[PDB]
CSV table of C-alpha atoms and ligand atoms in Angstrom, one decimal:
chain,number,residue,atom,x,y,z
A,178,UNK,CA,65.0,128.2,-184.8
A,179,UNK,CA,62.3,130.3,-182.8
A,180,UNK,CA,61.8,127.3,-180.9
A,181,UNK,CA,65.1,126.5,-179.5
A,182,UNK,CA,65.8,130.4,-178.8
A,183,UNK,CA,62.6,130.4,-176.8
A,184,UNK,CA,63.3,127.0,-174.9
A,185,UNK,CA,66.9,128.5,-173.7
A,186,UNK,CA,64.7,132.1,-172.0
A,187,UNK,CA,62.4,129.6,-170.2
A,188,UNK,CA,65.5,128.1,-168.7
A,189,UNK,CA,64.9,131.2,-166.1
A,190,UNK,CA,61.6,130.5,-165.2
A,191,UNK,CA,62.7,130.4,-161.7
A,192,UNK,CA,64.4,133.6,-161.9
A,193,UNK,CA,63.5,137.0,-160.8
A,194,UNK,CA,64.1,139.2,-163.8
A,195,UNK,CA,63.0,136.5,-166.1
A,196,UNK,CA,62.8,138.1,-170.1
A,197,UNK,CA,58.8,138.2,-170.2
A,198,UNK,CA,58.7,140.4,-173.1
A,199,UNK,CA,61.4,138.1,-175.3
A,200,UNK,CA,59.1,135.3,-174.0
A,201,UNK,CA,55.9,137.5,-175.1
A,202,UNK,CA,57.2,138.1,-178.8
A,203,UNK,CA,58.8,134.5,-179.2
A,204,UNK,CA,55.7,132.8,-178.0
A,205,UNK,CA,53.3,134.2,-180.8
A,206,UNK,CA,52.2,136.8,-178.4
A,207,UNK,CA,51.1,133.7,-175.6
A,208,UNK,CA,53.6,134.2,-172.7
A,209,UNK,CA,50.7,133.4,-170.5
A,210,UNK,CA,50.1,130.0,-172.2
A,211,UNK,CA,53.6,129.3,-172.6
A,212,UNK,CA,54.8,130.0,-169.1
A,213,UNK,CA,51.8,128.0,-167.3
A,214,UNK,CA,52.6,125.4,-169.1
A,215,UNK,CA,56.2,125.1,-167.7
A,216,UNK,CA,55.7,126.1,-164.5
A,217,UNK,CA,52.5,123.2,-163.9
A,218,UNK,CA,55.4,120.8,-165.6
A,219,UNK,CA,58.4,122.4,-163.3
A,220,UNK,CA,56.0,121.7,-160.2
A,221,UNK,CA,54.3,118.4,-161.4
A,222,UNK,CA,51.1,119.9,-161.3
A,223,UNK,CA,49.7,117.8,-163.5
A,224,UNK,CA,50.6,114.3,-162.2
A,225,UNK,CA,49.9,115.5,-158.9
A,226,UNK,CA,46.0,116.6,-160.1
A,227,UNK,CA,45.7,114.4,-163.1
A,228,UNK,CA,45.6,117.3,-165.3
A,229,UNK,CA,45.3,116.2,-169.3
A,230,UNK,CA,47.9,118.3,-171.1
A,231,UNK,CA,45.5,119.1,-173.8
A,232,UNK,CA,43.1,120.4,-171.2
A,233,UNK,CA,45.3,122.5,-169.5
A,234,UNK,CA,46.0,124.2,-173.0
A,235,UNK,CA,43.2,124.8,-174.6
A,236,UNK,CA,42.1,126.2,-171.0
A,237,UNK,CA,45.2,128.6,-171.1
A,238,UNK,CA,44.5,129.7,-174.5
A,239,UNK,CA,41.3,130.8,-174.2
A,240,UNK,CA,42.3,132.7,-170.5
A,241,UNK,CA,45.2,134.4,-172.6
A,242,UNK,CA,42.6,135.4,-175.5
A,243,UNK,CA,40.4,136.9,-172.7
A,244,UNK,CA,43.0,139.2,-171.7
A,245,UNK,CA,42.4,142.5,-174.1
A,246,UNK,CA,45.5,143.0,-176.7
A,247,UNK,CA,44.8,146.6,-177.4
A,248,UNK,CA,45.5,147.0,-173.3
A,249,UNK,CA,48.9,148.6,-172.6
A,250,UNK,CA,49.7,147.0,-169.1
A,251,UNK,CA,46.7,144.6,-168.4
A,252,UNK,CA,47.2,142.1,-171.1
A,253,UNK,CA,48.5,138.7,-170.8
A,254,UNK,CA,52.3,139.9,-170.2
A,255,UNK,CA,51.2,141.2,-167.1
A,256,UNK,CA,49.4,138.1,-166.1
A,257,UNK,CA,52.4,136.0,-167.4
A,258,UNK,CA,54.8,138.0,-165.3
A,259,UNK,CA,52.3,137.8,-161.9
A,260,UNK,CA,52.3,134.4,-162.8
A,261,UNK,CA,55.8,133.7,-162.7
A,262,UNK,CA,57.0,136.1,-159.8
A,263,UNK,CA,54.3,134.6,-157.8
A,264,UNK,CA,55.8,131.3,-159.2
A,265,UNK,CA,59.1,132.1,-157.3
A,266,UNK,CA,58.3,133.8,-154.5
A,267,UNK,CA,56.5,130.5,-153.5
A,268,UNK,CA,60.1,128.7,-153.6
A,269,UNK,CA,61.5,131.4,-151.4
A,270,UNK,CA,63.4,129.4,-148.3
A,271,UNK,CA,61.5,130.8,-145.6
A,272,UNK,CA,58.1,129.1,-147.2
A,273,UNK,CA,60.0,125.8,-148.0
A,274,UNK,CA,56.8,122.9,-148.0
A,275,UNK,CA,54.8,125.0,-146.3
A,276,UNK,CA,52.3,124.6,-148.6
A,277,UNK,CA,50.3,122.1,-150.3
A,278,UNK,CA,49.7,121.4,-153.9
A,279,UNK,CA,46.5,122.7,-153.7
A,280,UNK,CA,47.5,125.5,-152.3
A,281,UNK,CA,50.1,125.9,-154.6
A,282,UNK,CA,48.1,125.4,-157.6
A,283,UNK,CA,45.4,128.0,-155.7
A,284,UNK,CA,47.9,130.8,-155.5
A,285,UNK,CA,48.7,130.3,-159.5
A,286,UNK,CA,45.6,129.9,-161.1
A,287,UNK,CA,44.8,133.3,-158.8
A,288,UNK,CA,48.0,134.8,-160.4
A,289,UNK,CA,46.9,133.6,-164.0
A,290,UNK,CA,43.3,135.1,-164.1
A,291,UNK,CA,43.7,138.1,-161.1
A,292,UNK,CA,43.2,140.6,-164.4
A,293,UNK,CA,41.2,138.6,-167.3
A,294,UNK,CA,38.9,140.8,-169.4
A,295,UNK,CA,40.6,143.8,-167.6
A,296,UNK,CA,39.1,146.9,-169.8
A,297,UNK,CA,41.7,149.2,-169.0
A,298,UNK,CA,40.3,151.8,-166.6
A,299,UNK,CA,40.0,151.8,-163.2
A,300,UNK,CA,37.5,150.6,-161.1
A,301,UNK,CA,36.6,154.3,-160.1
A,302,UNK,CA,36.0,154.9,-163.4
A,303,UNK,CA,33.9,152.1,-164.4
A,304,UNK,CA,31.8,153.6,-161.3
A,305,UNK,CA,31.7,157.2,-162.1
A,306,UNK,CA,30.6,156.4,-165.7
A,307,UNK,CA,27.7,154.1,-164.4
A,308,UNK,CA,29.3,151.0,-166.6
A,309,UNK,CA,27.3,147.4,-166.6
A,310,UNK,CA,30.2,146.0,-164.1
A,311,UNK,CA,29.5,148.4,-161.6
A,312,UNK,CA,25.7,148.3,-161.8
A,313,UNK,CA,26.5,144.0,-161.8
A,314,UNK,CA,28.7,144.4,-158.6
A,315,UNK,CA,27.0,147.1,-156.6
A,316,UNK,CA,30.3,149.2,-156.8
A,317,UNK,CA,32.0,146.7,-154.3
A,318,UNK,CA,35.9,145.5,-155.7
A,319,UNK,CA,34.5,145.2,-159.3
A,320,UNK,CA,36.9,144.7,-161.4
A,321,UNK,CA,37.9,141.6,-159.4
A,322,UNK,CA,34.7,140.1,-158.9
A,323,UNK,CA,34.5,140.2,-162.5
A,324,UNK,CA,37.9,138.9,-163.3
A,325,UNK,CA,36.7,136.1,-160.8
A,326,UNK,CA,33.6,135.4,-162.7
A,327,UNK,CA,35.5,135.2,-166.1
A,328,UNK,CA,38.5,132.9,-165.0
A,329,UNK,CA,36.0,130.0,-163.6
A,330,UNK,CA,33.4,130.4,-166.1
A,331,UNK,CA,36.4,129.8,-168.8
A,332,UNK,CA,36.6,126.0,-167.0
A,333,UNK,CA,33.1,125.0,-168.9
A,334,UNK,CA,34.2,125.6,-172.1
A,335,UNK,CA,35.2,122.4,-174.4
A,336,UNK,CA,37.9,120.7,-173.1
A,337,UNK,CA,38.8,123.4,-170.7
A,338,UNK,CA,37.9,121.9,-167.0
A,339,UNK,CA,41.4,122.0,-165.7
A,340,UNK,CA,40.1,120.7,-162.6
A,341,UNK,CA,37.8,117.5,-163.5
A,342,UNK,CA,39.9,115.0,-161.4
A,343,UNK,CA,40.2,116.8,-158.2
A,344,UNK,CA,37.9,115.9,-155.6
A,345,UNK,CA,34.5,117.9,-154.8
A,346,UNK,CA,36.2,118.8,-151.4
A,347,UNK,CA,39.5,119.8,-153.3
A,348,UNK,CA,37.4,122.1,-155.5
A,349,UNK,CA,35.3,123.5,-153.1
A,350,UNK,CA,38.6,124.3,-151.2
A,351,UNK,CA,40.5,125.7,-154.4
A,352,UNK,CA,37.8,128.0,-155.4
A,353,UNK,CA,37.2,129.5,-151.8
A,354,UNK,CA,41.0,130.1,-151.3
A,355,UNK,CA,41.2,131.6,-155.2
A,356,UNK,CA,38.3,133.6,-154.6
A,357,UNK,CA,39.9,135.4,-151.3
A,358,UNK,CA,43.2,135.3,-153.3
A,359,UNK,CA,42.1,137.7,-156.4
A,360,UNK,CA,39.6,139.9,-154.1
A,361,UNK,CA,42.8,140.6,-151.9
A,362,UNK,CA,44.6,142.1,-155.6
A,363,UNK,CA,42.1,144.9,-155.4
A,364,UNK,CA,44.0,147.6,-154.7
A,365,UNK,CA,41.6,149.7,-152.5
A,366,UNK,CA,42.3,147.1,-149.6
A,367,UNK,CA,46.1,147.6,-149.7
A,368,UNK,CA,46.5,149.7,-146.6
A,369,UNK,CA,44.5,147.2,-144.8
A,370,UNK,CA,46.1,143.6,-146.3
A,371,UNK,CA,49.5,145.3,-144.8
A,372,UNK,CA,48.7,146.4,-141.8
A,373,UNK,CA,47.3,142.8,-140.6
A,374,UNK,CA,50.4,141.5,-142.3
A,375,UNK,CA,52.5,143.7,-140.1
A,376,UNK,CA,50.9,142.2,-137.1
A,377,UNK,CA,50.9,138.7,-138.4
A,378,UNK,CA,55.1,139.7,-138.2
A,379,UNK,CA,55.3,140.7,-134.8
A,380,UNK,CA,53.9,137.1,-133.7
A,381,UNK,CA,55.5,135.1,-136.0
A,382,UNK,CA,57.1,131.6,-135.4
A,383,UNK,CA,60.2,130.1,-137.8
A,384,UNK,CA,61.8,126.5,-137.5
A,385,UNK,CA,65.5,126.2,-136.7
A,386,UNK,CA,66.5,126.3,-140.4
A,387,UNK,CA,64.5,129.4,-140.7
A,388,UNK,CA,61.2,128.1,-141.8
A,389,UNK,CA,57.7,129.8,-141.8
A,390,UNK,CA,55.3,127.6,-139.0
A,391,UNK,CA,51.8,128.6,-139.9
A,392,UNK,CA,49.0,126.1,-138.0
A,393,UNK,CA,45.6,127.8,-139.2
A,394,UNK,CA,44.0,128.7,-142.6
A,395,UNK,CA,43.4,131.9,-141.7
A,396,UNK,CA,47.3,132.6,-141.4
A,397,UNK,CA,48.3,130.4,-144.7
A,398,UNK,CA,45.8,132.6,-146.9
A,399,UNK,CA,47.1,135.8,-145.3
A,400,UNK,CA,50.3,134.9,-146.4
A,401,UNK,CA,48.9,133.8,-149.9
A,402,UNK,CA,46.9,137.0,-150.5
A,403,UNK,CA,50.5,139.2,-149.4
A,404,UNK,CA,52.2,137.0,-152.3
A,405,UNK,CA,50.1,137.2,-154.5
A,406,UNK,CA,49.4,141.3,-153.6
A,407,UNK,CA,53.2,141.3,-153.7
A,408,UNK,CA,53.3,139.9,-157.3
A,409,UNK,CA,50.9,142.3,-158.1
A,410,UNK,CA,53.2,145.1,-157.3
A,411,UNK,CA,56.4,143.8,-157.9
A,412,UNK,CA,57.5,145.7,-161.3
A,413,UNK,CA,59.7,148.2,-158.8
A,414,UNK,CA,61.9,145.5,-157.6
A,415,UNK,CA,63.1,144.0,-161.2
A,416,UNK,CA,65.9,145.0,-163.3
A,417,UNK,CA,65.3,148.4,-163.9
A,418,UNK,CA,65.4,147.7,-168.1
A,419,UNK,CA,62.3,145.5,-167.2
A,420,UNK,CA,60.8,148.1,-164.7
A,421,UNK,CA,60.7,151.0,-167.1
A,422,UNK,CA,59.1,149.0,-169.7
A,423,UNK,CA,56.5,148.6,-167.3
A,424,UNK,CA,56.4,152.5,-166.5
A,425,UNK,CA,55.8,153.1,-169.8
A,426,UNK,CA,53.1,151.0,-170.3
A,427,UNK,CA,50.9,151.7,-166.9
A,428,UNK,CA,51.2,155.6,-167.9
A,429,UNK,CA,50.2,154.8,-171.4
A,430,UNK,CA,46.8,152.9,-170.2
A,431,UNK,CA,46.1,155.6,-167.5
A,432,UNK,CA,46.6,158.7,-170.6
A,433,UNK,CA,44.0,156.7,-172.4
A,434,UNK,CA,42.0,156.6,-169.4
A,435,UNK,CA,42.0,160.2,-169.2
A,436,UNK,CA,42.0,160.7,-172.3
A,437,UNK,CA,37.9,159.0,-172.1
A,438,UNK,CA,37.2,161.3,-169.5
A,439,UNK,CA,38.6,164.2,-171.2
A,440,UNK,CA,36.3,163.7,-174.6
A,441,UNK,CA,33.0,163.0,-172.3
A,442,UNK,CA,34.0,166.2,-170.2
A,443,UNK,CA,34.7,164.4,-167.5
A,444,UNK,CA,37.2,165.8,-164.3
A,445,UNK,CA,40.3,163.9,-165.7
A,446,UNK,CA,41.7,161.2,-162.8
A,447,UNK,CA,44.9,161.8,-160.9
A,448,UNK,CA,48.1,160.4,-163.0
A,449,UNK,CA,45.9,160.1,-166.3
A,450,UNK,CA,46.5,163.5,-167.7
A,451,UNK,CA,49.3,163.3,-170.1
A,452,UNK,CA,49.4,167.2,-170.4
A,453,UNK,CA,50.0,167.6,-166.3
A,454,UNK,CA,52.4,164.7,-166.2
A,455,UNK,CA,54.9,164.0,-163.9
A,456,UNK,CA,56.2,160.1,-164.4
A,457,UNK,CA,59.4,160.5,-162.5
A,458,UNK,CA,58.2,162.3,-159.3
A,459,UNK,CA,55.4,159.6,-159.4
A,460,UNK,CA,57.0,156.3,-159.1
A,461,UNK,CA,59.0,157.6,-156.6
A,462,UNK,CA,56.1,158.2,-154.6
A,463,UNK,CA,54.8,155.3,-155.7
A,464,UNK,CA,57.7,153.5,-153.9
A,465,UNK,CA,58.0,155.4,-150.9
A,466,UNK,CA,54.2,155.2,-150.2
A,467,UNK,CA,53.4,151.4,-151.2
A,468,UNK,CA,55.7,149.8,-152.8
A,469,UNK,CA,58.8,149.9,-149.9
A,470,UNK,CA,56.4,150.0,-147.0
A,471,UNK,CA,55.0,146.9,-148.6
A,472,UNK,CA,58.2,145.1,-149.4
A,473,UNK,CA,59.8,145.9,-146.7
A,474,UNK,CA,57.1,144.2,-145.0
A,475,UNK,CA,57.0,140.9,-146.5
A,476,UNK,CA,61.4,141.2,-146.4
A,477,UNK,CA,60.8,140.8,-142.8
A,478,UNK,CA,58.0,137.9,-142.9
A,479,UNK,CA,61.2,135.7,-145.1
A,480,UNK,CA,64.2,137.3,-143.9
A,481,UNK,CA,66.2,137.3,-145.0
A,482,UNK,CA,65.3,136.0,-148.3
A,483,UNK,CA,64.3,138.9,-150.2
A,484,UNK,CA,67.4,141.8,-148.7
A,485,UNK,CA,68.2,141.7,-152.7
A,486,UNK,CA,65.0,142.9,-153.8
A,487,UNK,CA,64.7,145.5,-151.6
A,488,UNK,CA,68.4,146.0,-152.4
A,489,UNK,CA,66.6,146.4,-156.1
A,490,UNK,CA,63.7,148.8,-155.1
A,491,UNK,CA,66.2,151.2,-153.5
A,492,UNK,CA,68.3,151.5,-156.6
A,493,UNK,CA,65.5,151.6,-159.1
A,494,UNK,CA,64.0,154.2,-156.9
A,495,UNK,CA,67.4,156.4,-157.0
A,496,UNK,CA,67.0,156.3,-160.7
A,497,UNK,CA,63.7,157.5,-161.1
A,498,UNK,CA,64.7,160.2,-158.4
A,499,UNK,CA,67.9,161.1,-160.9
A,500,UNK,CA,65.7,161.5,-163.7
A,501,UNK,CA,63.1,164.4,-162.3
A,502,UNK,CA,63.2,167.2,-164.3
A,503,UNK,CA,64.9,170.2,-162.1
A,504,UNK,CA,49.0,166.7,-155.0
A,505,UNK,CA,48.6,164.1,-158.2
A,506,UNK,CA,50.5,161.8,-156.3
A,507,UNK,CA,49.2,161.9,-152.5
A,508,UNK,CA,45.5,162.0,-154.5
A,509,UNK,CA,46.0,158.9,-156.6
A,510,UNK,CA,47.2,157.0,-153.2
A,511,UNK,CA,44.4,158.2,-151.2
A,512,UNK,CA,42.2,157.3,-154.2
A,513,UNK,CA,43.7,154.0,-155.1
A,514,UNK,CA,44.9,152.5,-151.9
A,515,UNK,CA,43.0,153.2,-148.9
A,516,UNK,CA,39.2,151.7,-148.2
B,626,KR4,C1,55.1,150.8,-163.4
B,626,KR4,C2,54.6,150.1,-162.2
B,626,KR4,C3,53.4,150.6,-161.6
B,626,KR4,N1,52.4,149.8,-161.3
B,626,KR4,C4,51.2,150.2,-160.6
B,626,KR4,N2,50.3,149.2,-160.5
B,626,KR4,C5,49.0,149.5,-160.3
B,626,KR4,C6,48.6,150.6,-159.5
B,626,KR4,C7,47.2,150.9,-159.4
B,626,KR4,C8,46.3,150.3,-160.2
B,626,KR4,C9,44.8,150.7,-160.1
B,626,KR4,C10,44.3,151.4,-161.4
B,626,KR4,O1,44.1,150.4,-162.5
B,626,KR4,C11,46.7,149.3,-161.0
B,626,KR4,C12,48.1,148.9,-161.1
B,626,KR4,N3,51.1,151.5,-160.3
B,626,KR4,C13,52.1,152.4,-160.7
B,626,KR4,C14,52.0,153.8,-160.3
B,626,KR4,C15,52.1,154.8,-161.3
B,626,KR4,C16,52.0,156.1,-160.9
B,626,KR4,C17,51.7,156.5,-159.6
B,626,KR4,C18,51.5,155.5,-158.7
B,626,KR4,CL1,51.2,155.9,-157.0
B,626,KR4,C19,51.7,154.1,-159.0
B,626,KR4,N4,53.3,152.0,-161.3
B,627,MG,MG1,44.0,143.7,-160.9
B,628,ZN,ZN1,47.4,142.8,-161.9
């Protein structure tokens, strides 16, 4: 019964808008497990690598219990849904075979793991309260060091090394480009991964059929770290019925951030106070700040195979706007986003 009405929502896999939450509640709560699992089969990821079925799920079971339940946005459906938008916005036309399998598999196994064990606070946070992590990581991009640490170390667990038949090379390669994948998702460096993507733009070469040409490294992880910071920060350009889910939940995890600051006496964060709210005016910023700049961005890179989602943004944007009622902000992006 459950079964067949879950097989049918996996049909769009491929699709932007896919119904992750249907997908989350069908699958037993493991939309991460369930939709890794398809997209490896979809892609042929395991003949490819040699990857035992039974090894890739008992690996994908344990990530997905390492993601915190009790977290309002980073849990597993958020994984699962940076999972599968990366998953398609590596099939956009502009990036047809432009990668490898290894690169492929890199920029997914980065999507799956970019947040594992994510606590629910910010790195700021974890560094004004003097936690363990930030004493670990010397302050520098710790929650994704961390997340890092966690997703690999997962591997050594029984029957979990997802990677035993690739190469020593192919390993070595996979972990560097994962490693500069998921440090490229913290979001202090956002001003900075854009503005060399904007410049990467300007010089760009495409094929007669409209086709990225990257010759170097250098320019092919650029363009996986975008995707994947894209991914990241792609709940603005779905169907709004999915966006505001989203909304709801980010604000949620924030309140209870500042709600932890608030009981310790602590100055309460910008956008975590849920008596000095404003979620509307907000996301709207949020767009207009990061979100457009950023999309618009990678819209040229493919043009023009993402016009709809920008198409998207603008009216998800226009609703927010409609629904204001007639510093936070510009603090939390100067906090959040910049160096
Ligand atoms: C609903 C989709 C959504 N995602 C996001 N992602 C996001 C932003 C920052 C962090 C770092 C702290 O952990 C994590 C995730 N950020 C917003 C947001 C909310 C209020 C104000 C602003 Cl400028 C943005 N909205
Ligand atoms: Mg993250
Ligand atoms: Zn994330």
């Amino acid at each position: 019964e459950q079964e067949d009405v879950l097989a049918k929502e996996l049909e769009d896999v491929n699709k932007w808008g896919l119904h992750v939450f249907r997908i989350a509640e069908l699958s037993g709560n493991r939309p991460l497990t369930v939709i890794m699992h398809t997209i490896f089969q979809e892609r042929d990821l395991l003949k490819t690598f040699k990857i035992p079925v039974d090894t890739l799920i008992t690996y994908l079971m344990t990530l997905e219990d390492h993601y915190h339940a009790d977290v309002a946005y980073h849990n597993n459906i958020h994984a699962a849904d940076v999972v599968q938008s990366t998953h398609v916005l590596l099939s956009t036309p502009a990036l047809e075979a432009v990668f490898t399998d290894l690169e492929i598999l890199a920029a997914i196994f980065a999507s799956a793991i970019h947040d594992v064990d994510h606590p629910g606070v910010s790195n700021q946070f974890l560094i004004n309260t003097n936690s363990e992590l930030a004493l670990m990581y010397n302050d520098s991009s710790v929650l994704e060091n961390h997340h890092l640490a966690v997703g690999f170390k997962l591997l050594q667990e029984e029957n979990c090394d997802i990677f035993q038949n690739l190469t020593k090379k192919q390993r070595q390669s996979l972990r560097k480009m994962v490693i500069d994948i998921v440090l490229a998702t913290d979001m202090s460096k956002h001003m900075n991964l854009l503005a060399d993507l904007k410049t990467m733009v300007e010089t760009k070469k495409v094929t007669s059929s409209g086709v990225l040409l990257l010759d170097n490294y250098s320019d092919r992880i650029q363009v996986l770290q975008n995707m994947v910071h894209c991914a990241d920060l792609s709940n603005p350009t779905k169907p709004l019925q999915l966006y505001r889910q989203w909304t709801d939940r980010i604000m949620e995890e924030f309140f209870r951030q500042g709600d932890r600051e608030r009981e310790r006496g602590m100055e309460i964060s910008p956008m975590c106070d849920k008596h000095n709210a404003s979620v509307e005016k907000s996301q709207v910023g949020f767009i207009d700040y990061i979100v457009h700049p950023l999309w618009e961005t990678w819209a040229d890179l493919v043009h023009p195979d993402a016009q709809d989602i920008l198409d998207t943004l603008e009216d998800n944007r226009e609703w927010y706007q409609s629904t204001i009622p007639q510093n936070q902000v510009s603090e939390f992006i100067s906090n959040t986003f910049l160096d």
